[PDB]
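== Polypeptide entry ==
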Amino acid sequence: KAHQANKYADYDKESVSFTGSVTDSAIVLKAVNAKKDAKKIDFYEDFSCPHCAELGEVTDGPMTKAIENGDIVVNLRILNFLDRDGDDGNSTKAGAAALAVAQSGDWETYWNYRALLMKEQKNIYGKWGDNDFADVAKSLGASDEVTQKIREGGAKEDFRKFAEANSKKLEKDGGSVSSPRVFIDGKEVKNGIETWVEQATS
C-alpha cells in the first residue's frame, strides 16, 4: 500500500561525487581521495529544527563542493533533542530513516533524502509516520532492503544511541544542546555561521 505520493512519482535528485561512512555515531561525508590534512567538521543538526533547514539552504551547496574537493570531511552528528526527551517523535523517525539509507552506502540517495526531509520539514512534522518516510526513501532510490528497514524502524535503536552520544559530545565541547552547530577541528563556529564553509577552507 502507498502512503506518500504514488509508485510513479519522480523526485529531483542532485548528482554528488562524494562517498561516506557511518563511523563513531556520525554520518561521515568525504571525497574518495580526501586529503589527509582536510579539516574535520562536526556538524550537529536535528531533522525537526527549522534553523537547521535554514542554514542548510545557505551552506549545503558550498559544503558539497568543499567535500567533493577533498578540503573538508564532514561528520554529520544527528540529534533528536527536539523530541523533548522522547525516543520516537519526528526527529527520531526522520533521523533513523536517513540513517538506514546511509548505512546502505547509497550516498546519492542519502544526500537527496536528507535535503528533502529538511526542505519539507514543516509539512512532514507530525504528519508523517514510518511508512511515509519509507515510501519517500524508496522513491528517491533506496533499496527494498532499506525501505523495509525504515518501515520496521530497524535503524532506530542505533540512531538513538548515536543521538545520545552526539548530545553528550556537544555538551562536552559546546556547553548545551541546540542545533545547528558547527565545529572546525574541535573549534566551534559561533560567529558568521553562514560562512562556516569559507572559514573551514580558509
User: Anything to note?
Assistant: DSSP finds eight helices and six strands in the chain. The longest strand covers residues 39-46. Strands lie at 19-23, 26-30, 39-46, 72-79, 181-184, 187-188.
